[PDB]
Amino acid sequence: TKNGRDSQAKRLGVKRYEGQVVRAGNILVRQRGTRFKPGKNVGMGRDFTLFALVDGVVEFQDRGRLGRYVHVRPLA
């Protein structure tokens, strides 16, 4: 009875939460599409991954119709 299939879990989601120090360029969120958009010092790769471009702390922000953004508020 054909059905025993499935794919292996991809383990994705936010990796670093709001108010968390981050090193140069470590990943912050792995997402299916654009559940989140870039931000201050926060670029995104082919798989829509979101990673830091600088050190400092991560902060989230909901911009309604705009989207949900995530960025690093640096310091040094």
The Cα–Cα gap between 49 and 74 comes to 20
The Cα-based distances of 65 to 39, 62, 69 in angstroms read 16, 9, 12
The verdict on 5 binding RNA (CB under 7 A) reads yes
3: contact with RNA by CB under 7 A: yes
Q: Please pick, from the candidates 24, 31, 44, 75, the single residue that binds RNA as defined by CB under 7 A.
A: 31
**Residue 55 contacts residue 25 (beta carbons within 8 Å):** no
When CB distances are held under 5 to 8 angstroms depending on the partner's kind, the choice from RNA, Mg ion, none that residue 31 binds is RNA
Question: Applying CB under 7 A, which of residues 7, 23, 75, 76 lies at the interface with RNA?
Answer: 7
Q: Is 7 in the site for Mg ion (CB under 5 A)?
A: yes
